[PDB]
């Protein structure tokens, strides 16, 4: 229940503001910057600010803080969801999130803000629906918003019905400094870019453990996702009733389902780090990486970031496979590898000097994270059964999907 | 299917070698379609197995069934889930409609000896579906 949502800037200048209820004066935004500065200087800065009896919730954007001032005890979750929807709409409409587009599309920005929500209650949130009624370069509102199916616009015609799926896998491993993995969770991502004619209703079917158990086929490799979140077009009633994933696919790229379950398997890459740091004399980087993934799978664009000393200089790298580059801005050496086949063993030997004068304050031990991304690999073993594409007119669809495995929160605790 | 005919003798030899009673990861072939075996495809596979032999009368085993399913998936891309047997005790009808292969006793259900037997009526009569309507949805 934010009184007014405004877009700020890095210098504190409000790029654009639009009051929704009028219960909060527009002058409260000026005091938001000093409050944020005081909180940052004292560590008390929070996204949800509080200017007396009015709370100015702000979200750190790419170039400006999306401050949404509120007066009463409005739904914080609802305000956050509205801000996220507005950010997504802006990203869809404007490819750049900076001050360049804030002052360049104000004429359409004001109309979009007015149409998005009224009296603090959001009304329009579909990017396609908003673009079909508000454009930067007006007819009556589309019937899709008024109709029940607000995620699949009717009347779409395409020469061919091709849908591109993406089996995105996020391998997050939390290995402590003792060598034991604490947080090992893999979050699935079923994103499909449906581009066909009409408004077909997708009939999702995969090798789900729950579905296999219900159908009596709970003996093969079935993916048991601890948390599965359906898309907006996905009907929750069918999923709750018999796990039937029946919903109208969106027009374009959309996230239908997102699996999320813990992983009890060994990490795809086993990295052993050695720190032979002398007392203000030299430093040793005994980094050894072992590929625990299948040999048939190669990790493309693997970048194992090893945090080097903050004041370290004149470093020498003695590695075997993969180029190592030290970035002064990042204050660490990333073990960049173009192609890393499964089972590969890369050994590195860092050697650099240190300044004679010791540091005045400690800098901490940031965890070592890798940027491995091996596609065409299904670590979870979940196999899609079929995709029920049904249209009233009747057409033969040719859906496509690719399985991509990448490294997410694969951070290794430093010694 | 020349590839299927070639793989049938090796699969039969591997099944015979395995008694009736190391690499991690899940690599996927690029561009290879994956879908469950159809009723017509299951019937054709059962007929081919019956004609070539080595499937009817063989002792049913978990290792042999897994090897056969893996060979079928490698040769045609069909998921190794349609080669299921009906719940016991007794003769286990095919889980997927259209399958011409079923497991029947040859003498706890696990300790009972099962043997693969051809069944033409299985492809036309949903015995497994009738026995377990809940499993068939």
């Amino acid at each position: 229940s934010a009184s007014a949502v405004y877009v700020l800037d890095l210098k504190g200048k409000v790029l654009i503001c639009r009051n929704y209820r009028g219960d909060v004066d527009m002058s409260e935004v000026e005091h938001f910057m000093p409050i944020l500065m005081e909180k940052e200087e004292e560590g008390m800065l929070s996204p949800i600010l509080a200017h007396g009896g009015v709370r100015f919730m702000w979200i750190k954007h790419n170039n400006l803080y999306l401050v949404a001032t509120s007066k009463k005890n409005a739904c914080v979750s609802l305000v956050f969801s509205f801000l996220y929807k507005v950010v997504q709409v802006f990203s869809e409409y404007f490819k750049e999130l900076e001050e360049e587009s804030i002052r360049d599309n104000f004429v359409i920005i004001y109309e979009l803000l007015d149409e998005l929500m009224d009296f603090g209650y959001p009304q329009t949130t579909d990017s396609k629906i908003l673009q079909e009624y508000i454009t930067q370069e007006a007819p009556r509102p589309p019937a899709t918003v008024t109709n029940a199916v607000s995620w699949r616009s009717e009347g779409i015609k395409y020469r061919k019905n091709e849908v591109f799926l993406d089996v995105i896998e996020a391998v997050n491993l939390l290995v402590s400094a003792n060598g034991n993995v604490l947080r090992s969770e893999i979050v699935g991502s079923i994103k499909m870019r449906v581009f066909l004619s009409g408004m077909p209703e997708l009939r999702l079917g995969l090798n789900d453990k729950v579905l296999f158990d219900n159908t009596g086929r709970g003996k093969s490799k079935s993916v048991e996702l601890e948390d599965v979140k359906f898309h907006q077009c996905v009907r929750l009633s069918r999923f709750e009733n018999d796990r039937t994933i029946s919903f109208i696919p969106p027009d374009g790229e959309f996230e239908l389902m997102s699996y999320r379950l813990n992983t009890h398997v060994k990490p795809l890459i086993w990295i052993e780090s050695v720190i032979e740091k002398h007392s203000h004399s030299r430093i040793e980087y005994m980094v050894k990486a072992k590929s625990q993934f299948k040999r048939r799978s190669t990790a493309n664009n693997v970048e194992i970031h090893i945090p080097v000393p903050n004041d370290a200089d004149s470093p020498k790298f003695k590695t075997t496979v993969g180029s190592v580059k030290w970035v002064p801005e990042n204050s660490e050496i990333v073990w960049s590898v173009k192609s890393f086949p499964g089972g590969k063993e890369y050994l590195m030997r860092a050697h650099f000097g240190l300044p004679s004068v010791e540091a005045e304050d400690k800098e901490g031990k940031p965890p070592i994270s890798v940027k491995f991304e091996i596609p065409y690999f299904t670590t979870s073993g979940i196999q899609v059964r079929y995709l029920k594409i049904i249209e009233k007119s009747g057409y033969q669809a040719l859906p496509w999907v690719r399985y991509i495995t990448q490294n997410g929160d694969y951070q290794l605790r430093t010694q | 299917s020349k590839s299927s005919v070639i793989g049938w003798p090796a699969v039969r030899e591997r099944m015979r070698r395995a008694e009736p009673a190391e690499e991690v990861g899940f690599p996927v072939t690029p561009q290879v379609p994956l879908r469950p075996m159809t009723y017509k495809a299951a019937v054709d596979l059962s007929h081919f197995l019956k004609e070539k032999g080595g499937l009817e009368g063989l002792i049913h085993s978990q290792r042999r069934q897994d090897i056969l399913d893996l060979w079928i998936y490698h040769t045609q891309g069909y998921f190794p889930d349609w080669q299921n047997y009906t719940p016991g005790p007794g003769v286990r009808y095919p889980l997927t409609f259209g399958w011409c292969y079923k497991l029947v006793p040859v003498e706890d259900p696990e300790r009972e000896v099962l043997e693969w037997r051809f069944d033409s009526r299985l492809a036309f009569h949903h015995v497994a579906r009738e026995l377990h309507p809940e499993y068939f949805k």
């Binding site: 799926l165 | 290879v32 879908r35 469950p36």
Partner: peptide
């Protein structure tokens, strides 16, 4: 081709489930 796994054809449903 494309990095991250080549696109593969998908079926319409589980043909073995009737």
């Amino acid at each position: 081709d494309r990095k991250g796994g080549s696109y593969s054809q998908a079926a319409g449903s589980d043909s073995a489930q009737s």
